[PDB]
Design a protein around this ligand. Structure first.
Ligand SMILES: Nc1ncnc2c1ncn2[C@@H]1O[C@H](COP(=O)(O)OP(=O)(O)O)[C@@H](O)[C@H]1O
Ligand SMILES: Nc1ncnc2c1ncn2[C@@H]1O[C@H](COP(=O)(O)OP(=O)(O)O)[C@@H](O)[C@H]1O
Ligand SMILES: Nc1ncnc2c1ncn2[C@@H]1O[C@H](COP(=O)(O)OP(=O)(O)O)[C@@H](O)[C@H]1O
Length: 241
């Protein structure tokens, strides 16, 4: 029976495409959470109010340490309110900006956590479209949380479960190098690069990391690893917390 007056609103955690995210405490049970406020005008505009109900339904029923929890939601005439797990350390994206690249241990760890979340998702017949750093939040103890321009993160085949592994390979590269592997001056250039799987490695990328990324960034989906092969990859196990 949720309503706005059920919450004490605190400082804005960030602005999104369709509204603001606020720190908020539930007066009743005194839960801490992130109150995400979406404007229906702006959702109807972008034509996203459809996909929103869907995405909300699915995300309600995921329970996993590395997937951001959606506790509830509600609305009024003008806006939709999403009651979200509060992630106190911000986005992986902004952490990539603060730091410039991630070290191997940090990178291996995120990928591990990412692969578990996706393994869990696959076990529920749920598939992501793209996992970008902006879509990843960090928990109180630095744990990764999937929250869910865009070109950069799309597989050649979108331009099957196997999409989520191209995603891992894009992220793994971005984490280590500081830029996405297919980054180019225009849309058309980026389209070609992704389409032909054209990436190169800077010298500091070690042999193990190159091997994993290369296995993940395979143009043809059937040749991409199983999530389990990622988890057990020698470079992963060598560097993951
Ligand atoms: N659960 C959360 N915990 C902490 N901060 C959040 C949470 N959700 C969103 N934010 C903050 O709000 C910012 C933008 O919100 P969001 O609406 O998710 O962006 P978009 O809709 O553009 O993907 C994020 O960069 C993040 O800092
Ligand atoms: N940290 C939290 N902040 C806000 N709401 C929460 C929090 N933890 C749980 N809830 C709320 O409590 C309800 C159920 O409690 P929860 O522990 O998430 O479920 P369960 O006990 O079944 O695992 C949810 O509908 C959600 O709204
Ligand atoms: N009363 C409160 N007001 C504002 N923020 C709070 C409050 N209580 C806890 N927090 C913050 O919410 C986050 C999660 O709280 P909690 O789960 O108790 O911390 P942790 O998970 O680190 O033990 C932490 O960043 C914490 O500092």
């Amino acid at each position: 029976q949720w309503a706005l007056e059920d919450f004490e609103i605190g400082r804005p955690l960030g602005k999104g495409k369709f509204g603001n995210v606020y720190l908020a405490r539930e007066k009743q049970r005194k839960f801490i959470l992130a109150l995400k406020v979406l404007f229906k005008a702006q959702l109807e505009k972008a034509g996203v109010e459809h996909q929103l109900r869907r995405e909300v339904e699915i995300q309600s029923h995921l329970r996993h340490p590395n997937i951001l929890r959606l506790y509830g939601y509600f609305h009024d005439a003008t806006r939709v309110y999403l009651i979200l797990e509060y992630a106190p350390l911000g986005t992986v994206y902004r952490e990539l900006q603060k730091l410039s690249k991630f070290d191997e241990q940090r990178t291996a760890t995120y990928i591990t956590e990412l692969a578990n979340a996706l393994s869990y998702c696959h076990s529920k017949r749920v598939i992501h479209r793209d996992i970008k750093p902006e879509n990843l939040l960090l928990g109180s103890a630095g744990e990764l949380k999937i929250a869910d321009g865009t070109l950069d993160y799309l597989p050649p085949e979108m331009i099957d479960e196997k999409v989520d592994l191209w995603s891992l390979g894009v992220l793994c590269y971005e984490f280590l190098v500081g830029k996405p592997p297919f980054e180019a001056n225009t849309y058309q250039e980026t389209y070609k690069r992704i389409s032909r799987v054209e990436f190169t490695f800077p010298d500091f990328v070690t042999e193990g990391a190159r091997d994993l990324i290369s296995r993940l960034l395979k143009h043809n989906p059937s040749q991409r690893p199983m999530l389990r092969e990622v988890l057990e990859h020698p470079w992963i196990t060598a560097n993951s917390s």
